[PDB]
Amino acid sequence: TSFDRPFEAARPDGENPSAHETLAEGGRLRPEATYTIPARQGRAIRMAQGEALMVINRDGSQIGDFWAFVEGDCGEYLSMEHLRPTLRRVSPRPGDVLVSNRRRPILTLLEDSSPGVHDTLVASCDVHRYAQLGHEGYHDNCTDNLRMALGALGLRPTTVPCPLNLWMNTPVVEGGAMEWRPPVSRRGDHVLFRAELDVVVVISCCPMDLLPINGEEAQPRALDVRLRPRP
Amino acid sequence: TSFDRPFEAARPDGENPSAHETLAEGGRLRPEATYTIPARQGRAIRMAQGEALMVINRDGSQIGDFWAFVEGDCGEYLSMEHLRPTLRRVSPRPGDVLVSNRRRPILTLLEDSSPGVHDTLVASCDVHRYAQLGHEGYHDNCTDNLRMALGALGLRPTTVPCPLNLWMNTPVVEGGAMEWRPPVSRRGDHVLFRAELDVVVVISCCPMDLLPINGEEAQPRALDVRLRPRP
Ligand SMILES: [Cl-]
Ligand SMILES: [Cl-]
Ligand SMILES: [Mg+2]
Ligand SMILES: [Mg+2]
Ligand SMILES: [Zn+2]
Ligand SMILES: [Zn+2]
C-alpha cells in the first residue's frame, strides 16, 4: 500500500496458508496433543483461563514471535512496554506475571528450559524490513502472519503490538548498541505460559532468512505447541 | 471503565485543562516564540516537514513523554520498537533518523545538550499505574494527556504508542534489572527534532509524583517548546 494511504493494522501485505488454515476449529486445541505451526507461518490458539501452553523449539534455533489478546477484545493485549516497568526487568523469567496494556495479568511465564534469552525490544518483521534488506517482491513476515492468523478466527487487530521474540538473542552491550548473536536455545527447548484471562495467543515462526549472523542466515523452521487443560 | 468493557485508546479516564486548551490555534505555533506546556498536562504541536522543534527542560529534572503522529493518520506514529532495530541501539543520539511503524523516517534527532540519557522502554503512566502505587481517586497521567491533547485538535488515536521518555534515567544493569535513577539533565537542557513528514507531536509533562528516587519524589514542573521554520 502506498504511503499516501493510511496504515491499517489488520490489512495483510500478502498471503500464505496462514490466511486459511487453522490448527483446530476456532483455535481450540485438543489437550495434551502436539500441533505444529509451519515454518514461515502463524497460527492463533484460544486458551481458557487457567490453561497452559507449551511452545517448543522443534529444531532448536528458531525465533517465535508471540502475542496474546484478550478474548473478545483485540484492543487489550500482552504489552512489552507495560511488562517491563511492572517487572522492573527487560525480559521475563519463570514465575513472572506478564501484563496487558491495562497493567493486569494476562499470562504467567511458568517454565523456560533454555538459558532464558528472549527479546522484548524489537518489532515484528514486515514487508518494509525485507525491502530495506534488499529483497525483491513479497516476503513472508511476522506482522502479516499475525494479521492472517487472527483473521482466520474472524478477528482483526486494531494495532500491531510489539512481539515477545522467543529465543531471540540480541543483547544490548556497553555503550547502548544492540548486538546480533545466534540463539542459545537447543532442540526441544520449551517455554510454558499459563492464561490468566481467556485469551487468543498468536505465534509466528519468523521467516527471517536474509540476515547473516556469525556467517550464516537463519533457516526458518517450524514450532510445536501443546495445550494443557486447567486442573 | 470496568474491564468487562473493551479498552479504548482514545477514551480519557479523567480530565484536566489539556482537554480544552491548545498552545495556539490548530497546534500551529508562531515561529521562534517560546510556549510553555503546563506541569502535569499535555499539548499537541503541528509541524510541517522540515521544521524543527526544541523541547526544553525548563526547570531541569522533568520527564517529557513524547509522541509523533503522521498528519492525517494517527495510525502511523513514531514507534519505539521500530526505532530500535533500525538504529541497532536502545535510545537515540543526535544525527539519528527516528522511524515510524512503517520504518520510514518521521523525525531526526538533531541536538541534545544533556548527557544523552532517555528511556524508550517504558509505557506512559496511566490510571492503572497510580492505582497500583496506592493512589485514591483520579491522578493526572500521560496516557490521558495524550488522548486529551489529540482530542483538542479533533484527533483520536487508534493505539497508545510507547512514549519516548525524554530525560528519564532508568538504566538496565547487569543481570537484566531496570534501576531507577534521578535524571542527569540540568535546567535549560534541550533536545531538537526535525520533522521528516508533516506531523502532530504530543508532549506530556509527566505528573509522576509518588515514586521516591534517592529519597525524594519527583515534583512535576512544566516544559518549554519553540518551533523553528523550514529554511
Ligand atoms: Cl503499510
Ligand atoms: Cl482501561
Ligand atoms: Mg553462506
Ligand atoms: Mg520526603
Ligand atoms: Zn519475523
Ligand atoms: Zn507520565
Residue B134, judged by CB atoms within 10 A of its CB (0-12, 13-18, 19+), counts as exposed
Cell numbers placing A3: 504511503
Binding residues of B for Zn(2+) are 65, 125, 142, 206
Residues in chain A with CB shorter than 8 Å from the CB of B132 are 103
Q: Nearest residue on chain A to B117, judged by CA atoms?
A: A176
Q: Does A2 touch chain B (CB under 8 A)?
A: no
The Cα B183–Cα B220 span in angstroms is 13
Concatenated DSSP letters of chain A: --TTSPP-TT--SS--GGGT--SSGGG-PPTT-EEEEPTT-EEEEEE-TT-EEEEE-SSSS--EEEEEEETTEEEEEB-HHHHHHHHTBSS--TTPEEEBTTSSEEEEEEEE-S----BSSSPPP-HHHHHHTT--S----HHHHHHHHHHTTT---SS-PPPEEET---PBPTTSBB--------TT-EEEEEESSSEEEEEEE----S--BTTB------EEEEEE---
Q: Nearest residue on chain B to A180, judged by CA atoms?
A: B88
Best CA proximity match to B42, nearest among B120, B167, B156, B143: B143
B31 Rama sector, left if φ>0, alpha if ψ -120 to 50, beta otherwise: beta
Phi, psi of B17 (to 5 degrees): -60, -15
Q: Do B84 and A121 touch (CB under 8 A)?
A: yes
> Could you tell me which residues are beta bridge partners of residue A70?
A73, A199
Question: How far, in Å, from the CA of B6 to the mean position of ligand 2?
Answer: 8
Indicate the domain borders of chain B: 16-167+179-231
Q: Which amino acid is at B104?
A: R
SS (H, E, C) B120-189: CCCCCCCHHHHHHCCCCCCCCCHHHHHHHHHHCCCCCCCCCCCCEEECCCCCECCCCEECCCCCCCCCCC
- CA A76 to centroid of chain Cα atoms: 16
Residues in chain A with CB shorter than 8 Å from the CB of B88 are 177-178
